[PDB]
Design a protein around this ligand. Sequence first.
Ligand SMILES: [Zn+2]
Lengths: 50, 133, 397, 397, 397
Amino acid sequence: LLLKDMAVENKNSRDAGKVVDSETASICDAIFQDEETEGAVRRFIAEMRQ
Amino acid sequence: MDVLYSLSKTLKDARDKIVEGTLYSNVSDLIQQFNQMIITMNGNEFQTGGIGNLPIRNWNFDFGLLGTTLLNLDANYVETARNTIDYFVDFVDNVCMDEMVRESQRNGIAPQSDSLIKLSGIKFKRINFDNSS
Amino acid sequence: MDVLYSLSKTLKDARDKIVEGTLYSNVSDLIQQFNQMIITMNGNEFQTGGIGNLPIRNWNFDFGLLGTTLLNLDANYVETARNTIDYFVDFVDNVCMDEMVRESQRNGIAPQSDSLIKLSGIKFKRINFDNSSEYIENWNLQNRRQRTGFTFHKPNIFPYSASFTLNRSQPAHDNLMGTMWLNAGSEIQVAGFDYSCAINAPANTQQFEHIVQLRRVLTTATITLLPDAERFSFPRVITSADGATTWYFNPVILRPNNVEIEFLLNGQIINTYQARFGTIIARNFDTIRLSFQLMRPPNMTPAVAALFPNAQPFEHHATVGLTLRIESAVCESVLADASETMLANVTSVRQEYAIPVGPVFPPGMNWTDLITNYSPSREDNLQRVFTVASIRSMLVK
Amino acid sequence: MDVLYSLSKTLKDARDKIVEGTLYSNVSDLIQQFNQMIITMNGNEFQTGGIGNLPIRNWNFDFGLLGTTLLNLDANYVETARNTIDYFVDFVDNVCMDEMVRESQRNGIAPQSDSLIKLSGIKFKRINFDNSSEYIENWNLQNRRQRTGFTFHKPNIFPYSASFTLNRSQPAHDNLMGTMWLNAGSEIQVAGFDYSCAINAPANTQQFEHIVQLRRVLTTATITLLPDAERFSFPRVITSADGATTWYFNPVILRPNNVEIEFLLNGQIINTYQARFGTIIARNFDTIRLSFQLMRPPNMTPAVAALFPNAQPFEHHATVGLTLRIESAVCESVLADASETMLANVTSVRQEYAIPVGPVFPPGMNWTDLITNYSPSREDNLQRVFTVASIRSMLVK
Amino acid sequence: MDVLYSLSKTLKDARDKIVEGTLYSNVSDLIQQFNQMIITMNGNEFQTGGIGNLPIRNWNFDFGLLGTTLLNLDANYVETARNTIDYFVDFVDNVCMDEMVRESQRNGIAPQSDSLIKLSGIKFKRINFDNSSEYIENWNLQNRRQRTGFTFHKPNIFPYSASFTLNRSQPAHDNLMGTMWLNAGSEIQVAGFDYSCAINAPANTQQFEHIVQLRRVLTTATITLLPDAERFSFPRVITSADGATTWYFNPVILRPNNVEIEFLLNGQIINTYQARFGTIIARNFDTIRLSFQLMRPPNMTPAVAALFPNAQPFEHHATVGLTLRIESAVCESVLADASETMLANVTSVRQEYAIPVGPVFPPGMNWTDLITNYSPSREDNLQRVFTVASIRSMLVK
Ligand SMILES: [Zn+2]
């Protein structure tokens, strides 16, 4: 296995954050918006770069 | 000189603020500073001792950056870090001691050791920070 | 019970083979066993303590398992594991100790504590594994009604006994004949004395004998037998048999004559050695009989002749002796010896927690008292209690 | 360090489980571990020796992995393997020895040699496994800070000390009162003597006491306590305290009266035994106090009365004594004992290679000197050095 | 031979790791090994016994394999297994015993019995496995002709010897000078006596010396050396050298002066200690030499002066002594010691079955006789026989 072959854009966040696979992606964009999710969440999702 | 200072507050605020548990953003501003260092260093070779009973030790730099990621720092993250710190500690000790014994009349306020004279170099100034000690 | 055992070898082979770095495929077979446990446990509640100065700590179970992936182990993996182990350690300790104090006249061979009684339950049996620890090894072989066996360096078979027997005495205690000895642990020292130096004895020889009956049979014993009893080779002032006065013993030592050691089993001579000093083997015996004589020297230089007059006062007391030490032996029953810490562990846990004297063991787990009246109940309880001490020492020393 | 350990259990479980005829699958889990090593190694070069008479040999690695010919190994398989093992054996030996001689005051708990310092490197951790060897087991538990613990037979806790203390003396040394003793290894013998046989003493009783302070606490000790000190039961000519003359000791032995043994910990009595001879347990102590008395016999036969006149000269010297032996015990610190070869291994390697005296250990690794001033530095160095000796003995004896 | 070994570790690791409960996965690697055996055996036929009182027994093989199916283990699984093990146990016992009795001069190293000779056959080699049992470990290393080594507590290196040597004597035996000693097991006690208290000796000092030659080299020895020989500190009446009369020994003890212990190897001093009492290390030696002196006290209180007149009769005999004990050591040759049961096992099996005296071993496997004339043949036979005893003790104690 290899990962580049699965690369995906973490639509949100500075640092050209790229994430694992489609599902990984979805989830992020999803939660990002469920307003009742600790400020730490967006943060983590954010800055966490490949 | 001032250079030297940083090297430490770097490590202290490091061996201190970096521990199994802490949340991310409490090291963001710090982490950076750190890496910045490793870079400037890697490639340059050093030498301490040569006087009296002071062992002549050789130092080399070639360490990987960091996994600027994981949220609530996992144990594993630390240990891979602490291993890198310990080489710098054991380093500085030898650096301090080596410049803590040489005396110069004419100009005795300036740096003496081959170790430090090299630090006052410009290419290193990229490190100085938090001079509150 | 056997259950218990596992719990440990699990943890040991765990706190041992699980270190930052090692390759997974070294623990694959292990990891499994582990998890299997957590499962069986989770959903169970326990309670230990309640006696004397022993705290009553309560426990519950609810744990996640362990990854199976990873070629090698990362530090992080360990710490998340060690945290789970430490709760089990601190657990078992409390479990052992709780069952290491209770005694039962009836079934002193069965589980006691609310903690363990629950373990012998069937639903827990799914955890047994690797029974190679010498003690458990023998626990099983016995439960199946078979031939047990243990190993001991300087076993502790002789209850302390230090006394004498005057075969010829008189009020003044100026012309005595008899024996004095010290039986303790794995050693026997015995001296035969004759104040008259066999002056009026047939063939000028006085016969002596010392018999020691073991409370348990010893097999495959390696024994050191030496002439002389150093312990009884010096001047002494001793209390009389009735305690009313004191007598004087002023020995002069001669070589024991016609030494014969017999190791008997149920009255039968199994091994016999005639005047053989050094290392001898006694393969199976429940009794030791030492026979030796004092023979008046037929030829004496003046200095010697002067010590042994034809008439009283007898001022130098002719003495012959023997020393016998059991270096190692095997016993079918547990015993204290000079190397194992079992007795000390059991005795120490009871002392530390101020455990009250019970119906089985003598106060303070006193060895002499225990071995002197080594009843079946004391032995079954001792074995249970020694086996638990050995399970505990695999993790906690 | 732990690294080091593996290297061996690897080889042992290797030179052991790898033989002409075993089914592959009995080593599948093993084989792997092995190879893994070779890899991590190859390429890096080492330096051992470079001190005293110790040779400086250079080791380099260039090895092919291990095949897997199915269904039990063929002779050929072994030999091609054994050839590779032998280079590692001869290696480790040189590695151990090189780190078994260096000492350091500041940090004498860490790796010293160029050989080992390089091993603690991270890129090697990938080897560690099966940490069941009692010593390494305790090495780890200490790095994390917890309850360590070792097992010893006839521990060597008492520095050699053979002396006396005259509580009543005079130039002629014809009416002395005091004690003499021998503390050595795991044994203590002490005698109290009173030339006057307590003729003018209150209640005709002379009190004696002997205190021994251990340099380390012993726990779970099984101890033999016997009345009398045979070592001090015979006539002696001794040097006076000031070395200016010699006195005469002519003992006659009486039973020690009101014997009380206390095992104290930080001044507190943990265990106390009153006149109990035989086997006793002392569960945790750093001090032993033996108190005993000489009581003038209230009733004496003529022969006895004659030894103890109302006026000098006092020609027979009343003596009472005790003998105490620690058969086994547990200590949180490494110690020499009567069974382990660690001290002897370390001392022997240093002697054979003419290793110069260093800054930590006394000349010749002298045990008495070491235990007398058992500093933290000496203990950390001793433990490091003992653990290495134990790693070495798994392969080289 | 190695074959034999396996057979056991197979059963042990079997009767141990196989029980009502555990997961298959923990024995998968094991189960296999096992079956593999059954196969190789089945079809073959054996014969054991036939000598002395040893019963003759024939054995056949025709057994089913093992369910490599199941996940966990159900009680039923065990019982159907244990039944098969018990036949092998009762087998091996008979196999061991049968080869533990036969001796042979020419080739006293290789197998003897019809039972074992058949095992060394090639077709069975398909069974070797896990040789970590200290003894077999060394059995192999010796085949490949390499550096072996065992571990012993209170080894048994000194054949019993208790005697004296009068360097100055006369018919009346009233002014003797010489030494007396006891060498036995791991201990030596030697006393030097001078009835004249060096009154006419140069520098008023009498020199003594005691040399003991070991039959095998001991390495890494931890030794206790103490001043005084308690065994020779009391009054004795001894037989004269020619057995024609008896002399009187009335010792008074003085400290040994200028004590020097040398541990030599092939005439070379390897270790030397000057007046060092307590624990000392002797790293490699085949000879011990103890030199010590009696120095007449230059200053004497009246009581002392009275014991040592300028002219005979000499009534108090000045004596100095030493005690040396080898607590532990390593030997390249098998030896009896204070902990191992090997000698006792071999001796016991031979005694129980009334095995006739053979051409190699002394009657009764007498240790003193054996170690006194420890020929290569006796050692090879002893090692074979000790290794078998150790294989047997893994299953039968
Ligand atoms: Zn012992």
